[PDB]
Amino acid sequence: TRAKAKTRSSRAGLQFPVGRVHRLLRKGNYAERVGAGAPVYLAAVLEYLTAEILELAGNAARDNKKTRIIPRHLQLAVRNDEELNKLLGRVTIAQGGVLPNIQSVLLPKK
Amino acid sequence: RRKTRKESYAIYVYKVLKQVHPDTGISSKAMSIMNSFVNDVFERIAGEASRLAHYNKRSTITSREIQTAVRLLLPGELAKHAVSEGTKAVTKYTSAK
């Protein structure tokens, strides 16, 4: 009899779907062949980058006293981090708004 | 009859959210943005890995093409931490046989 199946995601220690990533790499016309470690490495990077945005966005939610992440919290997470802002510099987030920022010369004299 | 399968990253984004912030939830608009972010970063990395294989006269995208594509695409410490996680995952997966 065949042994009980376990996900390549679980063999890698990942939440992100290694088998789906492998099928997307095979069907996406990236190369003739896909190596067995390629979808594991890519799934781990997508999971890590997801965890980076969500950690900062859950911090932004908590600072705004909300328990649910909304598009605003993803925008605050991304634009207050210089590296995610570099990664997402050409990206618009729908319902994200902008950072609070007034040019110093425009503020009233005191 | 019931509607056709639309494939999504939403359940894995939610599994990752429950790890970094177990009591925090997410809106479906914010989940839609997270799904777009995953699809965009996948296409960037796979596209650069694809160029790297072609430039080097190779038929195969390997863990090594993904690593160089990640070093090219991610800025600063995001690259170092992403390369750490990608290498840890392939090491664990290889040991599991």
Binding site: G13, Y48, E52, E55, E83 | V20, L78, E85
Partner: peptide, 8 residues
């Protein structure tokens, strides 16, 4: 094992 985030 947890994520090696830049923040942690």
């Amino acid at each position: 094992a947890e994520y090696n985030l830049r923040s942690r």
